[PDB]
Design a protein around this nucleic acid. Structure first.
Lengths: 42, 177, 245, 41, 140, 354, 136
RNA sequence: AUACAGUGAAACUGCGAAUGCUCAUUAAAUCAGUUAUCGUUUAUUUGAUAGUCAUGGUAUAACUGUGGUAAUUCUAGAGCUAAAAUCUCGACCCUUUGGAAGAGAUGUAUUUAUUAGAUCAAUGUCUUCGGACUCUUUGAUGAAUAACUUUUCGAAUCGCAUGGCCUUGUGCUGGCGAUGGUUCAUUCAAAUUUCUGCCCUAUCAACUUUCGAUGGUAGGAUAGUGGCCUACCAUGGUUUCAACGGGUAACGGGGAAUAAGGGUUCGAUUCCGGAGAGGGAGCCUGAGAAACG
């Protein structure tokens, strides 16, 4: 449509406008995965 | 800038034509005034020639009429409950032309009871006004239709709904409820 | 360009002045005024080219604001006042008047006019309308807006106005069988009685006119001016009767 | 400073206003008799 | 259903007072074109609300009056008429046929099907690609 | 106090049951200050469009507070005014102070009372010492100047005349407006003296072309059953002038209609009191001078007076041979006249009269 | 319908000097025999004989510009581009065509006379009854 | 001339300053023609046009003086100039010019709702010749309210009358010339817009919804309509009559232009069309600028 339909296609002006970014996690992802499992769902 | 040319739409043939000229002054479209509700702040714009066009961005008070007997008073708005264009518009309560609003009942009922002497709800033939009208009198919250461009006039004029109009709008609300 | 224009070449001058082509490089632009520019005559052309009263522009400016030329009763101080068709230019120091009228060749023509005939001027009544306070005003072709006219005045009429006070005196309604003056179109300059009209809404109202060689011809209603009946004009027309030999 | 020139100017302009207002009233009147005549006709 | 759109589709500047009772519910305004055309009784009693209707809407018809032959009638409230007229080619001095496939808004008061000599008149610009509006019908 | 923020700021807080209202005891305390400032804004003249809108806004704002509050406002109006000489005496005032300043104050007062009645038509109160004394006070010295002054004071005469007109008009309107909210019978005597004093002498040929306030006052009097007190207080001198006006042919239909409407209100509304024989005597004289009417002296007026005569005939309290000769002559005139604009049931009521 | 109804400036304008066809003009002068208004010899020759006599056209053009002075009462000046062009062209044609005051480029040209005459030319005779009417 | 009046620099204010060269090529685009604007704007022109305090406060510039800094056309702080008539009827005459007692009314601007754009004279018919009829014609009439608002206003401005009256106050009164202002018309313009017309090529049959493509409804926006833009939708339009596309040397063409007063087609003028004024981006006044000093 005008813009409603999700035209999945690559964008040239925002191709490398903020590509890439260094992985600034302050975690090691491992206990946080166990923790997200051990969140309020458990 | 914001233009209202035709120099960008497709041709009726269905092809894109050539660029003609830099976009001028007279073929301009100004910035849309999302007029909210609140402390009335008016802003003047100098349009072509020496014409002055007012944009009020907020308002509390509008001029409203009954043609039921021909009265019209300046009252304080209360809220935005319907408008046919956009649900988001209705939601965030940015009043426009042809908007459906809740308006106060107090000066109108004051005039009515000071003009007839009959308490609302609870000149006999003219005093038998419509039942939903007097129910909204009891509610203190009337339904009005702002029928004026606010972002052109800088004014806000409305009329309180009548039978078939009120009927369709009530049906609209009850279908959307 | 950025707006209107102010210079104009000799060659682009309208025909009904009948100029040369190399008196200068730019022509006298008419001032904006009571007549349309494409049908008007500026006084510098009138007093430099045609009647040869003056011969240089500074000189004619000098006479104009020696304040002798009176146009339409009043006095002008313009070097390029737009005098128009069927109009009045007098002059006190020669004790003369000139009613300006079109010829058969599509060009202007002066008419030597005596004082009392110069006292009045006709106007093609364009339209009457109800203005403010519910009063009527009538508008001619030449910007003439007059309060309280005849109710019998309709659109496309002709009213004679005395000029010593700017006041309406007489009126003639266009009907069938009138002494028309053709002004525009193909057939300017052929004056005779009309035949009739064809109506075309969304379009034009054509007029068939039979001139004195008993020849009919069709012209736009907008080109119509009204004089009177047959054999009685309200204007002392010149010799020729709108006939080209 | 107030001067007789100023006062006479003020008198003159107020006089012009009342006289041409009266002239407008006369114009309305004379058109009224004209219109009365041409409706009676 | 006549009022099936989002807003109350009504003819504006038209008041009906529910106090004093009436025969037909809304006194419906309609003016005359003039210009040789006749108002239709189907429009006079027409309950449709078309602000682009030349008789009941607030539109003016002043200028060119043409006619045409309809080919397709598959829009809402508007059609396209195709007119094949003669065209002159002087470098051959030969005639040819050329068709303008021109659109026009129609009023529901007139029912038009393919095979119609329709007489239309121009207006102020109605939409992006239309400046005509039908006034006269001759179906076959 | 600011002018550019006046109206908007009023609607900001002075509007009741909204945003930023004022508490009960506090608002009771700050009554006088609001009263003084609104009196000042009213005393500002409406000489421009903005001053017009300001005065309209002032009077629209006023009636929303409370009955004693607006009574206090009217009390301050009377306090700027006065009635002491006239009402320590019966009708005389010793200090002959009828100056242009005094009558200008009077006219401002009648302007503001016209304003408050027009805004609070069927709701505003009537305090006794607040309205009745200054009204007839101002009308009394209005007629005093009208009588005791020649035409040399065109200034005094003009605004005394307009003062009289406005006072009579607002008296008529307050009569139409309150009706029966209060026991009228306090100053019937003094007000009737000042009604029968100036105008009932020449009431015939003064107002025939146009309806006027005293005429519609008499309409309301004869229509209202409680103002049969007024009628019985009179020995029907005002009704005699009414007879004179309805006998004179130079009187407007807008005058004629209400007169016989109130006359048939007398006719149909009974009352068990004295002078009702005088009332029906007046009704007989009214039939006598309604004889030359209705065909040489409007369709709605014809239909109305037809219904009134239907009432007259259908109870028929007049049965004399003279009134019956009047009735048969009226019938032959009516049925001789053109009734093509009438309808079947109305014709059937005429038929029942016959 | 639709049309224009505008001033035919070009049609109310003249083209007679455009369609003039000088050899048969010379003949119709001989036939219509009015005397000629020719000048004397010193009025003829141009510039101590550096140029020719003059052409008959040039006599006409001088007479007309002198008429512009006669009524209009003003002259020309030394305007650069236009008169340099016209003066050069007219003098070159003087030195290439006119001999002793009469011209022969009129024969070296290529404008025919049948495009003027054209067997009655405008509103021509194209029907036999038109022939009958013109013969009677 | 003891207020000045001649003259005049600095400055306030009014208006104009919107009539410069270089670089890029489009075949309904442009251009020419023809409309429409009961759908818009207008400084200027001319024409009309508004009964609704013997005079209110300011400020500056300049000047004076004191300074800063390498330095601007840089900069500091101090002193300075209520009223008022008019329209509606009519009580009388006195018969002429009527004059008139007393009875009623009186802005524009903004925004919106409401309200606003069937009869008669005879001469006609009948006529009993007196008249009835407007049936049949000759002729006439039409077909503001409620409020709303930063108040717009209804001139605190230049050139000359010198009289008339007595209250001689220098009191009243007044006439003939300039600058402004309310609106409307008109003029100069401008914007879109109807339709009419321009090359080669199917070795171009597809094109549009992938900025709405087509249309509706509603709203914003604009001086103004209109998918110009957004919601809500309908699912369309163009096309071998070849749409579309490609090339066009499109310094091209327009009787656009005066023409060639006899060169074989040739001259002279005019419109090119757009963009730029270090480079993208944004803003500002004025009637008119997307001004690019």
């Amino acid at each position: 449509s005008k813009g409603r339909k999700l035209n999945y296609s690559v964008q040239d002006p925002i191709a490398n406008y903020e590509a890439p970014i260094t992985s600034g996690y302050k975690w090691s992802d491992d206990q946080i995965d166990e923790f997200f499992a051990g969140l309020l769902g458990q | 800038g914001i233009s209202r040319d035709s120099r960008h739409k497709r041709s009726a043939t269905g092809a894109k034509r050539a660029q003609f000229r830099k976009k001028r002054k007279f073929e301009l479209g100004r910035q849309p005034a999302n007029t909210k509700i609140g402390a009335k702040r008016i802003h003047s714009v100098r349009t072509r020639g020496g014409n002055k066009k007012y944009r009020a961005l907020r308002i509390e008070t509008g001029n409203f009429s009954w043609a039921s007997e021909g009265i019209s008073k300046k009252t304080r708005i209360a809220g935005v409950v319907y408008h046919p264009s956009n649900n988001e518009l209705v939601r965030t309560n940015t009043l426009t032309k042809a908007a459906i609003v809740q308006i106060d009942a107090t000066p109108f009922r004051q005039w009515f009871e000071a003009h007839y002497g009959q308490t609302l709800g609870k000149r006999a033939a003219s005093a038998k006004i419509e039942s939903s009208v007097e129910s909204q009198f009891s509610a203190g919250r009337l339904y009005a239709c702002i029928s004026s461009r606010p972002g052109q006039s800088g004014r806000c004029d409305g009329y309180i709904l009548e039978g078939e109009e009120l009927a369709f709008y009530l049906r609209r609300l009850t279908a959307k409820k | 360009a950025r707006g209107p224009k102010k210079h104009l070449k000799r060659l682009a001058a309208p025909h009904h002045w009948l100029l040369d082509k190399l008196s200068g490089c730019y022509a006298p632009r008419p001032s904006a005024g009571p007549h349309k520019l494409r049908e008007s005559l500026p006084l510098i052309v009138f007093l430099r080219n045609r009647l040869k009263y003056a011969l240089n522009g500074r000189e004619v400016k000098a006479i104009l604001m020696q304040r002798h030329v009176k146009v339409d009763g009043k006095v002008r101080t313009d070097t390029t006042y737009p005098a128009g068709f069927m109009d009045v230019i007098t002059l006190d120091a020669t004790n003369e008047n000139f009613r300006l009228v079109y010829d058969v060749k599509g060009r202007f023509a002066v008419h030597r006019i005596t004082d009392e005939e110069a006292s009045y001027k006709l106007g093609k009544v364009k339209k009457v309308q109800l203005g403010k306070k519910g009063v009527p005003y009538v508008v001619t072709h030449d910007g003439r807006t007059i309060r309280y006219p005849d109710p019998n005045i309709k659109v496309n009429d002709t009213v004679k106005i005395d000029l010593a006070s700017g006041k309406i005196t007489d009126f003639i309604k266009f009907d069938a069988g009138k002494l028309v003056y053709v002004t525009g179109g193909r057939n300017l300059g052929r004056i005779g009685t009309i035949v009739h009209k064809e109506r075309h809404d969304g379009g034009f109202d054509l007029v068939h006119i039979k001139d004195s060689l008993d020849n009919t011809f069709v012209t736009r209603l907008n080109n119509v001016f009204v004089i009177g009946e047959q054999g009685k004009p309200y204007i002392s027309l010149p010799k020729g009767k709108g006939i080209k030999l | 400073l107030v001067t007789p020139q100023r006062l006479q100017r003020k008198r003159h302009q107020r006089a012009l206003k009342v006289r041409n207002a009266q002239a407008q009233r006369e114009a309305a009147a004379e058109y009224a008799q004209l219109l009365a005549k041409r409706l009676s006709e | 259903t006549v009022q099936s759109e989002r807003a109350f589709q009504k003819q504006p500047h038209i008041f009906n007072n529910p106090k004093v009772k009436t025969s037909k519910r809304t006194k419906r305004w309609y003016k005359n074109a003039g210009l040789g055309f006749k108002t239709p009784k189907t429009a006079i009693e027409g309950s449709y609300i078309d602000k682009k209707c030349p008789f009941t809407g607030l539109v003016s018809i002043r200028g060119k009056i043409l006619t045409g032959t309809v080919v397709s009638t598959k829009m809402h409230r508007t059609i396209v008429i195709r007119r094949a007229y003669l065209h002159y080619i002087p470098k051959y001095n030969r005639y040819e046929k050329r068709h303008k496939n021109v659109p026009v808004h129609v009023s529901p008061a007139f029912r038009v099907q393919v095979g119609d000599i329709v007489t239309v008149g121009q207006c102020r610009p109605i939409s992006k690609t239309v400046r005509f509006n039908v006034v006269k019908v001759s179906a076959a | 106090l600011d002018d550019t923020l006046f109206k908007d700021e009023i609607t900001t807080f002075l509007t009741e049951n909204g945003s930023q209202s004022i508490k009960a005891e506090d608002e009771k305390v700050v009554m006088p200050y609001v009263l003084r400032i609104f009196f000042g804004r009213a005393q500002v003249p409406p000489t421009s469009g903005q001053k017009r809108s300001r005065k309209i806004a002032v009077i629209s704002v006023l009636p929303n507070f409370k009955k004693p509050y607006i009574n206090d406002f009217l009390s301050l109006a009377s306090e700027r005014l006065d009635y002491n000489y006239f009402f320590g005496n019966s009708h005389q005032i010793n200090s002959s102070k009828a100056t242009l300043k005094t009558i200008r104050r009077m006219t401002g007062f009648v302007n503001i009372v016209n304003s408050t009645l027009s805004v609070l038509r069927t709701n505003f109160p009537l305090h006794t010492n607040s309205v009745l004394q200054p009204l007839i006070y101002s009308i009394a010295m209005a007629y005093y100047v009208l009588d005791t002054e020649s035409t040399e004071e065109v200034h005094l005469r003009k605004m005394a005349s307009n003062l009289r007109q406005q006072g009579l008009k607002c008296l008529s309107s307050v009569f139409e407006f309150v009706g029966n909210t209060f026991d009228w019978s306090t100053s019937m005597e003094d007000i009737y003296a000042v009604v029968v004093k100036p105008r009932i002498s020449h009431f015939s040929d003064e107002n025939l072309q146009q309806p006027s306030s005293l005429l519609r006052l008499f309409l309301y009097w004869a229509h209202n059953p409680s103002l049969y007190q007024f009628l019985y207080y009179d020995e029907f001198a005002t009704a005699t002038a009414l007879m004179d006006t309805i006998s004179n042919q130079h009187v407007k239909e807008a005058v004629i209609g209400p007169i016989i409407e109130a006359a048939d209100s007398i006719i149909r509304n009974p009352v068990n009191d004295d002078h009702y024989v005088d009332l029906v005597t007046l009704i007989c004289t009214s039939c006598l001078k309604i004889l030359p009417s209705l065909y040489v002296k409007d369709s709605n007026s014809i239909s109305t007076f037809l219904n009134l005569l239907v009432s007259i005939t259908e109870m028929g309290f007049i049965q004399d041979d003279h009134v019956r000769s009047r009735l048969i002559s009226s019938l032959i005139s009516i049925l001789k006249g053109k009734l093509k604009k009438l309808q079947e049931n109305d014709t059937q009521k005429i038929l029942k009269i016959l | 319908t639709h049309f224009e109804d505008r001033f035919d400036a070009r049609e109310h304008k003249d083209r007679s000097n455009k369609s003039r066809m000088q050899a048969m003009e010379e003949y119709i002068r001989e036939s219509s025999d009015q005397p000629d208004w020719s000048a004397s010899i010193g009025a003829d020759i141009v510039n101590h004989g550096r140029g020719g006599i003059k052409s008959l056209r040039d006599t006409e053009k001088e007479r007309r510009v002198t008429s512009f002075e006669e009524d209009n009462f003003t002259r020309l000046n030394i305007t650069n581009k236009a008169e340099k062009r016209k003066q050069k062209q007219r003098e070159r044609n003087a030195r290439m065509n006119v001999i002793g005051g009469e011209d022969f480029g009129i024969f070296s040209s290529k404008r025919k006379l049948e495009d003027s005459t054209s067997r009655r030319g405008a509103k021509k005779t194209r029907s036999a009854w038109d022939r009958a009417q013109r013969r009677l």
